[PDB]
Every structure is written in C-alpha cells, then in structure tokens.
Amino acid sequence: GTGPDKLKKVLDKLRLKRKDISEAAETVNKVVERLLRRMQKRESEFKGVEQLNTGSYYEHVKISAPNEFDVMFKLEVPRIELQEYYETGAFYLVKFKGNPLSHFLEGEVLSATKMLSKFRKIIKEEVKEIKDIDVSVEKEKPGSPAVTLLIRNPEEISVDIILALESKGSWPISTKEGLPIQGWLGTKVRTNLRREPFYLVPKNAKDGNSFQGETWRLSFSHTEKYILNNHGIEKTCCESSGAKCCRKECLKLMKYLLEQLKKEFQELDAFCSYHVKTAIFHMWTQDPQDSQWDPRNLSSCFDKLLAFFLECLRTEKLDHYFIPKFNLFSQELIDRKSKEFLSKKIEYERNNGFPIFDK
Numbered sequence: 001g002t003g004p005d006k007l008k009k010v011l012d013k014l015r016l017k018r019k020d021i022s023e024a025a026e027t028v029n030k031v032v033e034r035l036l037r038r039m040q041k042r043e044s045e046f047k048g049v050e051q052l053n054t055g056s057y058y059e060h061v062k063i064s065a066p067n068e069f070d071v072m073f074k075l076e077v078p079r080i081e082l083q084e085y086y087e088t089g090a091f092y093l094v095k096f097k098g099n100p101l102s103h104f105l106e107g108e109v110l111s112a113t114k115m116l117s118k119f120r121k122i123i124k125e126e127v128k129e130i131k132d133i134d135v136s137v138e139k140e141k142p143g144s145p146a147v148t149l150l151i152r153n154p155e156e157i158s159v160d161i162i163l164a165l166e167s168k169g170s171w172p173i174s175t176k177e178g179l180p181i182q183g184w185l186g187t188k189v190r191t192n193l194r195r196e197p198f199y200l201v202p203k204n205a206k207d208g209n210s211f212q213g214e215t216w217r218l219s220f221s222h223t224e225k226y227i228l229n230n231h232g233i234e235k236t237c238c239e240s241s242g243a244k245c246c247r248k249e250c251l252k253l254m255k256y257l258l259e260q261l262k263k264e265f266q267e268l269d270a271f272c273s274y275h276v277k278t279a280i281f282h283m284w285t286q287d288p289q290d291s292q293w294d295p296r297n298l299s300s301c302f303d304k305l306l307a308f309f310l311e312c313l314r315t316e317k318l319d320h321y322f323i324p325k326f327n328l329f330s331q332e333l334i335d336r337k338s339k340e341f342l343s344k345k346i347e348y349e350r351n352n353g354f355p356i357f358d359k
C-alpha cells in the first residue's frame with residue numbers, strides 16, 4: 001500500500017491488459033497480411049506496398065484499446081523532391097525530380113487527396129474478396145486520411161491503415177540537429193539510423209491553405225521502434241544476459257496517466273501519447289545511464305518524467321525529437337489554458353497518490 005508498491009501494481013494491471021491486446025493483434029495481422037497479399041498481386045500504383053512493422057504494438061508499449069489498431073503501409077517512391085511547407089519541418093509538399101505516380105499530380109505537387117482516393121478505392125475492392133474473415137471498410141470520414149477496416153471476430157476491431165511514402169534520400173535538413181543520441185546510444189548508432197529511409201504521412205496543415213489537402217508530415221516510426229527496442233547505453237539492457245531497466249515501464253505509466261486523464265477531461269483533447277513519447281525521448285537523452293533507470297528507481301524515475309513534462313507545459317516547449325524547430329507545445333498548436341489545466345491535474349495526481357490510476 002505504499003507509493004512504490006502502488007505504482008508496481010499499476011504496472012501489473014497494464015500487464016494483464018496485454019493478453020487481450022496480443023490476441024486482437026493476431027487477428028489484425030491475419031487480415032492485414034491477407035490484404036497486403038491481395039494488393040501485392042493486383043497491378044496498380046500500390047503494388048509495391050509493404051507493412052511497416054512499427055507503432056506502439058511492435059514497440060511493446062500499446063497499453064490499452066484492444067479494439068483499435070493503427071498500421072502503416074509503406075510505398076517506396078523514387079526521386080522525391082521535398083519542399084518545406086512550414087520551415088520548421090512540420091509539413092512538406094512532395095514534388096518530383098516518366099513517373100509512376102503521375103496520375104496523382106496537381107501540377108508539380110503530389111496530391112495526397114488523389115493518391116489516397118485511389119488507395120481507398122482499391123482497398124475497398126480487395127477487402128470485399130476476403131471471404132473467410134468478417135471484414136469491411138468503414139465509410140470515409142471527411143478529414144480522416146486513414147482507411148479504416150472493421151473486423152468482427154465477433155467483437156469489432158477498428159484498424160486504421162495509414163499510407164506512408166518511403167524515401168531513400170538523405171533525411172531532410174529540418175532534421176539535421178535531431179536525434180540527439182550521441183551521449184546515450186552514440187555516434188555510430190546515429191550515423192547508421194540516419195542512413196535508413198524516412199517516411200511521409202498525409203496530414204492537413206489547416207492553415208491559410210491553397211495546398212491545404214496536399215501536405216505531408218515526416219515520420220520516423222522505424223527509428224522510434226529501434227530506439228524503444230534498443231534503448232540502453234549497454235547493448236544488453238533488458239536482454240537475457242543483461243540487466244532490466246525501467247525505461248519502458250515509465251513510458252507505459254505516463255501514457256496510462258494521460259489516457260485516464262483524457263477520458264475524464266475533454267479539456268485535454270489536444271494532448272496525445274506522442275507528447276509523452278517525445279518527452280521520454282528527451283528524458284532518456286538527459287539521463288543516458290542505464291543505472292539512472294534501475295528498476296528499483298521506478299517511482300523516482302516516474303516522478304522525474306512527470307517533472308520534465310510539467311516543465312515542458314510551463315514553458316510551452318516540447319521539441320519534436322527528430323525535427324528540433326517543430327515545437328509540439330507551441331501556443332499556436334495548444335492553448336495556454338489547456339497546458340495550465342493539464343499541469344494542475346498532473347500535480348494533483350502526483351500529490352495525492354495517483355487516484356486516477358484506479359478509474
């Protein structure tokens with residue numbers, strides 16, 4: 001019943017939530033594999049699609065909602081020329097240096113709207129041919145670029161399929177000072193990770209417009225997965241012949257704290273798990289030693305993450321780990337009132353034994 005024991009019990013509660021999630025993931029994977037086989041057999045601009053096995057499930061940090069999954073389909077696109085749409089690196093237009101994607105251009109700019117419309121049309125046709133699993137495509141929602149499958153097993157699982165372009169070019173200059181892992185995972189790892197492809201995911205800016213509709217955000221979901229699964233200064237961190245740390249446990253707890261708060265308070269709508277992930281990436285940089293994340297320090301490590309997060313809220317600053325000029329907590333993206341509200345709620349939990357965990 002002490003504070004430390006209670007936090008360990010929350011981790012036990014999250015451990016129990018995993019079984020339903022793992023079972024659901026196996027059903028999701030069967031459907032997704034079936035669909036990818038169909039899309040790989042059919043002749044189209046999307047024939048080369050593959051699953052990118054990233055996101056919270058494959059990082060082992062999906063803590064809730066066994067009825068909701070996101071999956072990314074990557075498509076290699078040669079000779080992408082990027083234009084920064086926001087010079088922070090928050091958004092890009094895609095242009096090209098014939099061209100396999102020529103049907104989806106609006107002038108020299110790749111239309112996410114056109115490309116996604118065709119993606120959706122094909123998915124819808126091919127899903128109707130999957131006869132031995134109960135699966136349909138959800139009606140398109142304006143402003144939602146994912147193509148959502150509805151699987152009945154017999155319970156309903158929603159799967160959001162996100163198209164990601166893959167570029168094998170050098171990472172965008174907005175990322176030059178990003179991935180600050182040099183004192184933690186080191187310079188050789190950083191070099192190696194930056195030699196890997198990067199991804200572009202459709203996302204509407206919702207700004208002045210014109211090319212509202214045709215903007216893309218950068219995605220490093222592969223790099224993030226690698227970091228989560230290779231997160232120690234020692235190569236053996238959390239392996240069978242190494243020592244456990246509490247890095248992922250702290251991420252899980254903080255994600256759960258935010259999830260529980262968000263369920264109760266619609267004033268926290270603008271926050272999301274990626275804020276917590278980004279914060280913990282910075283914490284792992286700040287405190288690189290595995291000994292700083294000893295399992296015995298679960299409570300103190302959790303508390304330092306909350307303190308760091310509260311300082312990000314106070315300063316309205318949380319830099320994208322890969323794109324340092326992109327401030328996820330800018331005044332423009334999140335109102336001061338929302339940040340002050342979340343600060344208050346976090347301090348309350350922290351000072352009163354985290355009652356919200358129990359809801």
Ligand SMILES: [Zn+2]
Pocket residue numbers: 231232237238243244245246247
């Ligand atoms: Zn570890």
